[PDB]
C-alpha cells in the first residue's frame, strides 16, 4: 500500500494551504471537498493515484463519461457523412449543414456503443483494403 499519500484532511501542509486561501467562492467549497475526498502528497496538494482498488469509481466515472461523449460526437459525424455520400453534391452538404439529416444522426448516436457493435459484427464498420485509395509501394 502506498504510504507517502495520505488523506488531505490529515495533511499538515494541506491544512496550511486551507487557512491561507482567500475567502471567495473559488476556495471555500473546493477545499472542503478536497479535504474529504482527495489524497495529498507531502507538498499539501491533491494527487491522483491509479494504484487503489477502492475509489475505482472515481477513475471509471470520468473516463466512461468522456468516452461516451467523444464517441457520441464521432458517431454523429460518421453517420452524417455516410448519409450525404448518396447525394448528388455531398460537398455542399458539408459547408451547408443539412439540419434534418444532422438531427437524425444525433438522435441515433445516443446509442452509439450498441450501434458500433452491430456495425462491427455485420462487417459494415470498415471498408475492404482493396477498395481504398492507396499510394504505390
Amino acid at each position: 500500500a502506498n504510504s507517502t499519500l495520505v488523506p488531505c484532511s490529515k495533511s499538515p501542509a494541506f491544512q496550511a494551504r486551507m487557512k491561507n486561501a482567500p475567502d471567495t467562492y473559488y476556495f471555500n467549497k473546493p477545499f472542503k471537498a478536497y479535504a474529504k475526498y482527495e489524497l495529498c502528497g507531502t507538498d499539501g496538494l491533491p494527487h491522483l493515484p491509479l494504484d487503489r482498488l477502492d475509489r475505482a469509481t472515481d477513475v471509471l466515472v470520468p473516463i466512461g463519461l468522456f468516452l461516451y461523449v467523444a464517441g457520441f460526437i464521432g458517431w454523429s459525424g460518421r453517420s452524417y457523412l455516410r448519409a450525404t455520400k448518396s447525394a448528388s453534391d455531398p460537398e455542399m452538404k458539408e459547408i451547408f449543414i443539412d439540419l434534418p439529416l444532422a438531427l437524425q444522426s444525433i438522435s441515433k448516436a445516443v446509442l452509439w456503443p450498441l450501434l458500433a457493435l452491430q456495425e462491427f459484427l455485420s462487417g459494415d464498420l470498415t471498408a475492404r483494403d482493396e477498395e481504398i485509395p492507396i499510394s504505390p509501394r
Binding site: G41, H47, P133, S135, P136, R137
Partner: protein
C-alpha cells in the same frame, strides 16, 4: 519521482513518437506517395517537384530527416 516526473516522461514520449513518426513516414514514403508516385526515380535528396499539383516543398525523404532533426533536438 512524483507528479512532476509523470508529466515530463509523457512529454518525452510525445517527442519520441513524433520524431519516430517523421522518420518512419519519410522512410516508408521514400519510394513514392500519392503526391509523387515516382519518387524513387528522383533519389533520396532533391529540392521538390515544382509548384504543380498544389506544391511539393520538402517532399523528398531527405527532407523528412531534415524535419526530424528539429524534433530530435526538441
Amino acid at each position: 519521482i512524483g507528479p512532476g516526473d509523470f508529466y515530463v516522461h509523457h512529454a518525452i514520449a510525445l517527442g519520441l513518437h513524433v520524431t519516430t513518426l517523421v522518420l518512419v513516414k519519410g522512410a516508408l514514403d521514400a519510394r513514392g506517395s500519392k503526391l509523387m508516385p515516382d519518387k524513387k526515380d528522383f533519389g533520396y535528396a532533391f529540392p521538390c517537384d515544382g509548384p504543380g499539383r498544389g506544391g511539393t516543398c520538402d517532399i523528398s525523404a531527405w527532407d523528412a530527416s531534415y524535419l526530424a532533426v528539429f524534433w530530435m533536438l526538441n
